[PDB]
């Protein structure tokens, strides 16, 4: 839709992106070496998503300023800026691949997996993560907004990190105390971890562009954005197992992972004392057998039933949320995104 | 001295700093559990060492702004600004002790060789670098030079980090290709991974803090603080080896690490197609019997002696630097530091 065509400029916008970064190295010919290693960290990380975060900046920017005020100058920082996020987001997923012991990402090896990078990719992550920085500079330095989105993207790596901390002691690497694993814990979880950044961050960089930088007009959309992720990571909890393969393109090792899913914080709330000893010893397992014996327990449980309802639910939650504290703003802003997550 | 008798009140304000930062949880309970993680990181990362880099800010902060600008409130924030420097430090140690693998620092183990930390110490370290800007926010906020502190800790972290990518390039965890252990990478990489950060960051901050915003005053300070830089790890390098482990406090593992060390640059300078061959077979290696062969082999070429050369010739050039580039500012601020490398 929306996205589908203005992904196109996004994408090829990119090329700049890596040109003006890796172009400081003109006047420090004595670093090129390193600006070469910082391209292909770019080229390799910050490409082969969907960009999905970066094109909400560029959509949102476009319902939320006016056609007059939205000359080429203007364009090019919302795109820069749409990318500034695809490149906080490269950051958190080279960093987190390490951390987790991943093998693959957006269907390739990951980054620290190739041969000649390994631990190293830790400085390249916290290179993706300057480059932010570099960006805002080069390209909005002068526009009055500028001091509010550092401090945007700033909070939005300590949200993020904060939230990165809760899971990792929530789901230690190994033990399997599901105690652990309650409702608000994940929840909170998910707001740190995932809807702060992924759905407060770019809407909020289009409004600071735009002008609207109220304290409270950002509050209430805060309100609408953080309810999005939620429901977001909780469908892709349900679709993680209950997704079919060739649809989402991608195939579920939640269970395998020991991951503190939105499963498998309901199956503890609807479990009879035997379904739980089932689940500590088939959760956190290779073995398609035990895995499949898990995602039995699941159906049992009418989870599937259990989402759906929560899914029709949190539809009207949101419809409600928007139609309360939308305006000033275009409720199309907020729409155009719930349509996409929603199925 | 200057350092020793106001390090009291900076070691002292840790306190407030780690209470100031884990405090913001009072009001989301629900991160708690983070905070708690988060305190444990700060108390034993940001704290054991020299305190050189954060006291050198409070330290040029009360010889660049006159005495009765220095208010409880205006010596808080410096207090403040110069931990933000240690977090920084502690943000790229954390780091750079996965990376290459090492085993203790500041006497005590590795953060992340610590039982139940391992691969987390990466985020662990990217919210020390995050405490950095919630300290600024929430100290400089209304200050007219808080764009400009944040601006600084951006760079002085983007440039360590592309520092650091050329030291990984230099010498390959593994590869002892001691070709491109060339002075122009040496120094380059001193610039960038240390000098800045070590030297101008602090000074600058100070002098930001005081109102001295000029970019040709900056550029002055730079030009002098990077020149005591090169010095300083020049000398570091040279100690590493021929230093005193009783009065240094430390034991030389340089060699052993395959470090691009300055001795080592040296000598490749001056051997012979023979000598050469004797370094590349003992070069990078645990054995005593082969770092001794190296150190024999550096002594031979009268190191020592060109580094008390250089050291002498160093300090002549500093001087001259100070009394060229030094004002408006007192020259005491950068004799001060002066005095305190040079032995
Ligand atoms: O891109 C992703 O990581 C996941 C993802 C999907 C999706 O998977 O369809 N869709 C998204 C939308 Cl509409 C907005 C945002 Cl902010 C993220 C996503
Ligand atoms: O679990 C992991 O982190 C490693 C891993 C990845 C991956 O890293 O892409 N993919 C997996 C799949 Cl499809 C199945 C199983 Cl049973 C394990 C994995
Ligand atoms: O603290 C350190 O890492 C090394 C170090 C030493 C020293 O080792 O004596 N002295 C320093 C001084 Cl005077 C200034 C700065 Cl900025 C760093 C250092
Ligand atoms: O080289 C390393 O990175 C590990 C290491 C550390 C250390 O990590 O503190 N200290 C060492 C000493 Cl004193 C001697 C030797 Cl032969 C190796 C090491």
């Given at each position: 839709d929306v996205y589908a065509q203005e992904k196109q400029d996004f994408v090829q916008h990119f090329s700049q992106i890596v040109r003006v970064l890796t172009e400081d190295e003109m006047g420090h010919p004595e670093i090129?070496?390193?600006?070469?290693?910082?391209?292909?960290?770019?080229?390799?990380?910050?490409?082969?998503?969907?960009?999905?975060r970066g094109l909400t900046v560029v959509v949102a920017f476009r319902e939320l300023v006016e056609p007059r005020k939205q000359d080429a100058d203007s364009?090019?920082?919302?795109?820069?800026?749409?990318?500034?996020v695809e490149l906080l987001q490269a950051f958190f997923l080279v960093a987190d691949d390490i951390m987790d012991?991943?093998?693959?990402?957006?269907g390739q090896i990951c980054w620290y997996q190739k041969p000649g990078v390994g631990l190293d990719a830790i400085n390249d992550a916290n290179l993706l993560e300057a480059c932010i920085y570099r960006l805002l500079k080069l390209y909005c330095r002068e526009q009055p907004y500028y001091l509010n989105?550092?401090?945007?993207?700033?909070?939005?790596?300590?949200?993020t990190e904060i939230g990165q901390t809760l899971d990792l002691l929530t789901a230690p690497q190994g033990n399997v105390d599901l105690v652990r694993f309650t409702?608000?814990?994940?929840?909170?979880?998910v707001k740190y971890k995932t809807a702060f950044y992924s759905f407060y961050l770019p809407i909020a960089a289009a409004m600071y562009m735009a002008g609207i930088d109220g304290e409270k007009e950002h509050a209430n959309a805060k309100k609408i954005l953080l309810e999005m992720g939620e429901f977001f990571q909780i469908q892709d909890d349900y679709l993680d197992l209950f997704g079919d393969p060739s649809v989402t393109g991608k195939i579920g090792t939640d269970i395998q992972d020991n991951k503190c899913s939105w499963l498998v914080?309901?199956?503890?709330?609807?479990?009879?004392?035997?379904?739980?000893?089932?689940?500590?010893?088939?959760?956190?397992q290779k073995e398609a057998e035990k895995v499949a014996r898990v995602?039995?327990?699941?159906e049992e449980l009418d989870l599937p039933a259990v989402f759906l309802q929560y899914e029709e639910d949190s539809y009207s939650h949101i419809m409600a949320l928007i139609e309360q504290y939308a305006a000033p703003?275009?409720?199309?802003?907020?729409?155009?995104?719930?349509?996409k997550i929603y199925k």
């Amino acid at each position: 839709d929306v996205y589908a065509q203005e992904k196109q400029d996004f994408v090829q916008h990119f090329s700049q992106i890596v040109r003006v970064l890796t172009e400081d190295e003109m006047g420090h010919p004595e670093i090129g070496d390193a600006i070469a290693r910082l391209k292909e960290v770019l080229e390799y990380n910050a490409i082969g998503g969907k960009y999905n975060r970066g094109l909400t900046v560029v959509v949102a920017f476009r319902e939320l300023v006016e056609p007059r005020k939205q000359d080429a100058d203007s364009l090019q920082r919302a795109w820069t800026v749409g990318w500034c996020v695809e490149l906080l987001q490269a950051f958190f997923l080279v960093a987190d691949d390490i951390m987790d012991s991943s093998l693959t990402r957006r269907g390739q090896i990951c980054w620290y997996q190739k041969p000649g990078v390994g631990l190293d990719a830790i400085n390249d992550a916290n290179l993706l993560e300057a480059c932010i920085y570099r960006l805002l500079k080069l390209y909005c330095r002068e526009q009055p907004y500028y001091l509010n989105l550092i401090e945007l993207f700033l909070q939005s790596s300590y949200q993020t990190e904060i939230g990165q901390t809760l899971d990792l002691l929530t789901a230690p690497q190994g033990n399997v105390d599901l105690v652990r694993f309650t409702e608000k814990r994940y929840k909170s979880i998910v707001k740190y971890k995932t809807a702060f950044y992924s759905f407060y961050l770019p809407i909020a960089a289009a409004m600071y562009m735009a002008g609207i930088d109220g304290e409270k007009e950002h509050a209430n959309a805060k309100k609408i954005l953080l309810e999005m992720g939620e429901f977001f990571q909780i469908q892709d909890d349900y679709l993680d197992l209950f997704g079919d393969p060739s649809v989402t393109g991608k195939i579920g090792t939640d269970i395998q992972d020991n991951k503190c899913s939105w499963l498998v914080v309901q199956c503890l709330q609807r479990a009879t004392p035997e379904q739980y000893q089932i689940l500590k010893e088939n959760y956190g397992q290779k073995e398609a057998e035990k895995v499949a014996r898990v995602k039995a327990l699941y159906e049992e449980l009418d989870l599937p039933a259990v989402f759906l309802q929560y899914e029709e639910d949190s539809y009207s939650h949101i419809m409600a949320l928007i139609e309360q504290y939308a305006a000033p703003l275009p409720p199309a802003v907020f729409l155009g995104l719930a349509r996409k997550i929603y199925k």
